[PDB]
Amino acid sequence: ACSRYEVDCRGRXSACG
Amino acid sequence: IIGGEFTTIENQPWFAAIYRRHRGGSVTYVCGGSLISPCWVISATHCFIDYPKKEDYIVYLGRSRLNSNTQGEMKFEVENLILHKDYSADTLAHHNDIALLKIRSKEGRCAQPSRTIQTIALPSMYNDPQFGTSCEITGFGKEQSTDYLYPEQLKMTVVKLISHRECQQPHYYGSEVTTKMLCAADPQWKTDSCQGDSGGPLVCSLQGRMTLTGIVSWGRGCALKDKPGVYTRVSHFLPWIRSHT
Ligand SMILES: *Cc1cc(C*)cc(C*)c1
Ligand SMILES: [Cl-]
Ligand SMILES: [Cl-]
Numbered sequence: 001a002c003s004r005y006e007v008d009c010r011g012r013x014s015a016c017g
Numbered sequence: 018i019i020g021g022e023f024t025t026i027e028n029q030p031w032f033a034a035i036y037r038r039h040r041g042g043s044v045t046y047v048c049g050g051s052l053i054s055p056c057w058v059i060s061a062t063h064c065f066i067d068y069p070k071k072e073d074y075i076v077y078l079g080r081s082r083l084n085s086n087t088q089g090e091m092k093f094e095v096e097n098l099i100l101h102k103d104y105s106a107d108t109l110a111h112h113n114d115i116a117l118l119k120i121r122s123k124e125g126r127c128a129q130p131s132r133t134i135q136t137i138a139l140p141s142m143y144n145d146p147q148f149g150t151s152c153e154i155t156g157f158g159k160e161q162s163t164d165y166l167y168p169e170q171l172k173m174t175v176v177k178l179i180s181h182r183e184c185q186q187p188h189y190y191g192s193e194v195t196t197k198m199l200c201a202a203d204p205q206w207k208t209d210s211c212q213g214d215s216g217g218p219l220v221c222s223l224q225g226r227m228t229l230t231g232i233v234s235w236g237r238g239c240a241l242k243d244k245p246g247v248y249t250r251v252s253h254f255l256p257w258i259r260s261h262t
Contacts, residue, residue, distance in 0.1 A: 013239050
């Protein structure tokens with residue numbers, strides 16, 4: 001997963017979606 | 018930043034390092050930004066959309082390391098956090114990915130130029146460098162897409178502007194690329210922005226001036242063939258910038 005400490009959570013590369 | 022070189026803030030002295038304070042008082046990095054006037058840093062709305070409350074953010078100028086302090090840095094609170102009311106992101110692209118942070122030190126002051134801190138100029142309306150022009154990007158973002166850690170020292174690299182024509186090809190981005198964007202990449206596809214670099218500057222010499230042509234916004238993967246970095250196109254956002262600033 002990915003938590004609230006994640007750097008640039010919606011950046012390119014991110015596991016967001 | 019994929020590829021490129023380690024640098025120091027003196028070589029990119031408009032770069033802003035933006036952090037978020039947590040519930041317990043831990044602080045983590047968020048995104049980059051650029052100092053466009055003494056009291057104002059410009060960045061990307063996507064960096065803030067999930068946590069839009071100005072009070073959680075800290076901005077450093079004159080800072081060359083991610084998790085350590087460096088000589089000549091200055092620390093600011095965020096007095097106003099201005100997000101684009103039209104931000105949208107489909108699955109890949111982010112639209113209106115632009116944000117403004119009005120900065121203020123605990124003594125109530127804005128930035129002062131120094132060896133490590135300077136403003137960067139905006140382009141005049143609709144004025145962008147010719148395609149194929151070499152520009153710079155900088156940031157604390159990942160050195161490889163597959164990395165879990167971030168570099169401790171600031172990095173910069175060089176990428177070239179690509180045309181919308183080129184950037185709109187189904188094997189590139191198609192219409193995913195609006196005229197409020199700009200594509201840039203390495204001719205050899207070896208260097209690029211990556212996660213953690215968002216919000217940071219795309220700097221180009223334009224009519225004799227170091228100019229913030231773009232803001233790191235989005236792309237497919239990092240340093241992939243036919244997949245340039247996409248930037249918020251600053252020349253097309255002046256009225257928003259003036260009215261909010
Ligand atoms: C896990 C996570 C975190 C953020 C900020 C955004 C998305 C999509 C996912
Ligand atoms: Cl905490
Ligand atoms: Cl707005």
